[PDB]
Amino acid sequence: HMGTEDLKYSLERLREILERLEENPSEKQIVEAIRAIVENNAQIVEAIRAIVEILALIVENNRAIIEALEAIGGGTKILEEMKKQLKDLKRALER
Amino acid sequence: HMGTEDLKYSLERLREILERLEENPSEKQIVEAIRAIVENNAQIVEAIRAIVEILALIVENNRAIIEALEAIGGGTKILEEMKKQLKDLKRAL
Amino acid sequence: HMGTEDLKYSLERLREILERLEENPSEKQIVEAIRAIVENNAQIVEAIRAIVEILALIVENNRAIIEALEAIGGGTKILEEMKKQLKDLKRALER
């Protein structure tokens, strides 16, 4: 559940409120548009959090993949490179 | 990065618009600032959806990698882990 | 991680500003909300840039992985698919 549907929904409601604001500006409509922006930003944060969670799972999957390759046995150099890349991916996500 | 430069540009434009709004908060300038915010957020939604598509492509690539490892290395404990991880990834996307 | 905590808090600050905006939708409160929206967006852009970079690193890691598989098992039909997938991923990251 990446939540892209509700992210899109929140953008469309914001667009509708913007059109009404453009046609008949007022304090009421400015507040309504800012409230819609906040709701759209809320869905953006949720989508970003869900993405970051998937990234962590992918990196864990690659960790297991690289362990399988080590077990099979292979070139020293390529294994060292893959491990270093994995190390940097872990660091990036832990930052 | 992919479209990051466009997002960076749109952000700098918002900062410029904000500075003009701060010294001239007219109704018209407020509406134009809000217009720019929406246009920027539309770009963000687009970039997020593009990221999600790449995540699906990565996960399909890892599915193939794990199949390749099964054919070469056989049935291992580590193979069991990879399949479980992959199943969760496919379910979560 | 990856700034998600800062994004969540930034959203909370926006909501609090919106509460006071609804209380008195003066120009000062409107500009305060818009200034906070821009600051929040700056963090969103930064989070998306960090995400895109991790994506490229993961593709780089998968490229090394497939390099290792070819060195271990030689040419295979699954290797053909994986290299076409990599190229498509590399193309997606440019566009």
Numbering used by the authors:
A (entry chain C), C (entry chain B): 1 to 95
B (entry chain A): 1 to 93
Structure paper excerpt:
Inspired by class I viral fusion proteins, such as influenza hemagglutinin, we chose homotrimeric helical bundles as the fundamental architecture.
The interaction energy between the flipping helix and the inner helices in the short state was tuned by combining hydrogen bond layers (“A”) or hydrophobic layers (“X”) in different orders in each of three possible positions. SEC-MALS measurements indicated that, in solution, XAX, XAA, and AAA were trimeric as expected; CD wavelength and temperature measurements for XAX, XAA, and AAA showed that the designs were helical and highly temperature stable. The number and position of the hydrogen bond networks appears to determine the state which is populated—designs with one network folding into the short state, with two networks, into a more dynamic short state, and with three networks, into the long state.
